[PDB]
Design a binder for this molecule. Structure first.
Ligand SMILES: CC(C)[C@@H](CNC(=O)C1(C)CCC1)Nc1ncnc2[nH]cnc12
Length: 167
């Protein structure tokens, strides 16, 4: 039993809710919150900008030190950093950004990072400003992640569409 509430069950291991991931994280304080990161960990907008703002920019300060030491992530890759006031840990995962021309096949590789964590609160990778079809992203999630994933979908209209079209 865990503290996630109000989720709809899609499969054995995937759950979905219409929620603001920042507010969901603030209340649950999950072990892992997933950030929709880019390779530079520049948290300007979308989910990343919102998570970073909720940390009062501490996420960005930590991220800048990470990049200065290690260089950029790979598209499809990830790193574990602090969850600050939102979670124990933040798993920064880089899905492909269609608005930059990155290969959508890398979306499966991005979701594979979730399998290193038993339970996660996460957004749909490559959705929103990353330009992928969120319905495709949900399908890849269900077909790739084997650990327990709680998906927060900010837009109520999108949420209804994802549920109603789910196979
Ligand atoms: C749109 C909601 C309110 C947003 C949370 N907004 C905010 O924190 C602020 C306005 C930014 C300073 C406060 N969160 C998400 N933004 C994008 N994509 C998502 N997917 C799941 N949640 C989200």
């Amino acid at each position: 039993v865990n503290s996630f509430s109000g989720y709809l069950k899609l499969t054995d291991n995937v759950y979905i809710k219409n929620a603001d991931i920042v507010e969901e994280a603030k209340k649950v304080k999950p072990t892992v919150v997933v950030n929709a990161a880019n390779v530079y960990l520049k948290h300007g907008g979308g989910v990343a900008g919102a998570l970073n703002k909720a940390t009062n920019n501490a996420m960005q300060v930590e991220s800048d030190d990470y990049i200065a030491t290690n260089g950029p992530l790979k598209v499809g890759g990830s790193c574990v950093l602090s969850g600050h006031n939102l979670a124990k840990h933040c798993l920064h995962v880089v899905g492909p950004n269609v608005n930059k021309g990155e290969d959508i096949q890398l979306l499966k590789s991005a979701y594979e990072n979730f399998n290193q964590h038993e339970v996660l609160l996460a957004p749909l990778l490559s959705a929103g400003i990353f330009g992928a079809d969120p319905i495709h992203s949900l399908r890849v999630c269900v077909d790739t992640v084997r650990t327990n994933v709680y998906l927060a979908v900010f837009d109520k209209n999108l949420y209804d569409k994802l549920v109603s079209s789910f196979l």
